[PDB]
Amino acid sequence: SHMEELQNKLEDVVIDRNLLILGRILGEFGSVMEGNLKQEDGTSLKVAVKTMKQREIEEFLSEAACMKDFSHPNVIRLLGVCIEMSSQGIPKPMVILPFMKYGDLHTYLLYSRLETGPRHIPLQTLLRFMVDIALGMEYLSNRNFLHRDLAARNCMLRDDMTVCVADFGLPVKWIAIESLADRVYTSKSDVWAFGVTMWEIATRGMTPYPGVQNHEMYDYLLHGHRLKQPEDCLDELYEIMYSCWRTDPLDRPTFSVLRLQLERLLESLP
Ligand SMILES: Nc1nccc(Oc2ccc(NC(=O)c3c[nH]cc(-c4ccc(F)cc4)c3=O)cc2F)c1Cl
Ligand SMILES: [Cl-]
Ligand SMILES: [Cl-]
Ligand SMILES: [Cl-]
Ligand SMILES: [Cl-]
């Protein structure tokens, strides 16, 4: 039953604080730390730990339990959560994820445009990044999960270069036209944000809409303007991402449709 499934998820989301040791800051709303997690088989695992600052706390726990129960290779796996208490009596919620040494997709795309950073990223890999993200989002949306902050900064690179969808939980230019006004939000709003994320990846990390300030943003879209085609972006890839920003959400493709369009384009590549 609905209460049964929720209580089951709740049961195995919590990690004993003594199985975890925190390490150095990776980033600093909250902070992200490197850490170690003792697994049940006796060995420890490198993890990332995210820390923040009672009705909100059950909300954090139940939403963490829901994400951990999700399982798909292009959705970040949430290993568990841990609730500390601060001296001043403020709870300190912590989220445990696998440590991914390649970091987030956005910083990686930027790094790749520096000699010392990752090598230049071929088109084939850039489109394989989009396929991966579309796969995680297909799985999520088939569950009526709404992401609401999709962007390359929130996609993570795994050791085998698989991309998985995440949310640091810590952006006008990613928000669908209808959500800018009515604040209505559907998976078709997520589809809009995916289109922009595809554009981030194709530009190797440009901020969307150069020359357009955030306050000008809804007016800019109101008159039918969209993100421009990056150079050396295939026209077929640009039409796919343009389809994500159709004015009428109902006309935008689903993630399942997008994913197959993108897998089709990828195999056509010599
Ligand atoms: N190097 C390195 N390696 C690993 C992680 C890392 O940082 C982090 C990267 C991601 C996260 N995510 C979360 O806390 C999180 C919490 N609730 C829900 C989601 C979620 C939301 C939507 C969705 F579709 C999928 C998941 C989360 O993602 C935390 C980090 F600390 C770093 Cl920096
Ligand atoms: Cl060990
Ligand atoms: Cl990994
Ligand atoms: Cl643009
Ligand atoms: Cl345009």
Numbering used by the authors: 568 to 595, 598 to 622, 628 to 744, 763 to 862
What's the paper's own text on this?
MERTK is a member of the TAM (TYRO3, AXL, and MERTK) receptor tyrosine kinase family. Myeloid epithelial reproductive proto-oncogene tyrosine kinase (MERTK) plays an essential role in modulating cancer immune tolerance by regulating macrophage efferocytosis. MERTK is activated by autophosphorylation when protein S or growth arrest-specific 6 (GAS6) ligands that bind to phosphatidylserine (PtdSer) are exposed on the surface of dying or dead cells bind to MERTK. Therefore, the active/inactive state of kinases can be determined by DFG and αC conformation: the active conformation of kinases should adopt the “DFG flip-in” and “αC swing-in” conformation; all other conformations in DFG and αC are inactive kinases.
Previously, a thermal shift assay using purified MERTK kinase domains in an in-house kinase-inhibitor library revealed that 8 of 356 compounds exhibited a melting temperature shift of >1 °C15. Among them, BMS794833 (IUPAC name; N-[4-(2-amino-3-chloropyridin-4-yl)oxy-3-fluorophenyl]-5-(4-fluorophenyl)-4-oxo-1H-pyridine-3-carboxamide; Fig. 1a), which is currently being studied in phase I clinical trial as a treatment for advanced solid tumors, was co-crystallized with the MERTK kinase domain. The X-ray crystal structure was determined at a resolution of 2.16 Å. The clear electron density map for BMS794833 showed that it occupied both the ATP-binding pocket and the allosteric back pocket (also called the hydrophobic patch). BMS794833 formed two H bonds with the ATP-binding site and two H bonds with the allosteric back pocket of MERTK. The amine and imine at the 3-chloropyridin of BMS794833 formed H bonds with the main chain of Met674 of the ATP-binding site. Two oxygens in the 4-oxo-1,4-dihydropyridine-3-carboxamide group of BMS794833 formed H bonds with the side chain of Lys619 and the main chain amine of Asp741. Specifically, 3-chloropyridine-2-amine interacts with Ala617, 1-fluoro-2-methoxybenzene interacts with Leu671 (gatekeeper) and Phe742, and fluorobenzene interacts with Ile650, Asp741, and Phe719. No salt bridge was formed between Lys619 at the β3 strand and Glu637 at the αC, which is essential for the active conformation, and the αC-helix extended outward from the ATP-binding site. BMS794833 is a typical type II inhibitor with a DFG-out and αC-out conformation, with a similar binding mode to MERTK as LDC1267 but similar to merestinib in its chemical structure.
